[PDB]
Amino acid sequence: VQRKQFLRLLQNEQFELDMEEAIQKAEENKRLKELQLKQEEKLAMELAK
């Protein structure tokens, strides 16, 4: 019983960590996509000019 309660508490901590990672990854993806699009547009402008 004692170690089962310990496992339950550790699982709760793992749930919080999983939620934090799930909210960070979307921000990273949005930043990468925006940077790639802006760089592509600038390169097109320069070559055309």
Partner: protein, 126 residues
């Protein structure tokens, strides 16, 4: 037997799907089942006797004189429709129980004679 039965020393067991199933069958809490209008729990603890007799019907928000509602019928400021959401009813019961329980009797070795017969004050002396 020797070809197929190999040690597999690759740390195979998985230990998280059981706990995910535990939480999935445990389900939603109070705040996501029954709690309404995102209300904090400190506000609605009140009683009719205290709100009507003890507090003398003190509601600063409501005007003293009722006015006609206009678009609807009837008189608008209703005391029974708008009760008081003040801090709740309190008196010395919590403090008395705290003093009776949380006191640890810091004098561990204390005879009945010494505890019952201290030096009396001169003010209470006659």
């Amino acid at each position: 037997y020797r070809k197929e039965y190999i040690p597999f020393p690759d740390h195979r067991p998985d230990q998280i799907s059981r706990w995910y199933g535990k939480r999935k069958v445990e389900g939603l809490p109070y705040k996501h089942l029954i709690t309404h209008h995102q209300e904090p729990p400190h506000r609605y603890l009140i009683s009719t006797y205290d709100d009507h007799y003890n507090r003398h019907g003190y509601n600063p928000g409501l005007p003293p004189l009722r006015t006609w509602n206009g678009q609807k019928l009837l008189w608008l400021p209703e005391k029974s429709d708008f009760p008081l959401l003040a801090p709740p009813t309190n008196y010395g019961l919590y403090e008395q129980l705290k003093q009776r329980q949380l006191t640890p009797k810091a004098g561990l070795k204390q005879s009945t004679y010494t505890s019952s017969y201290p030096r009396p004050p001169l003010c209470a002396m006659s």
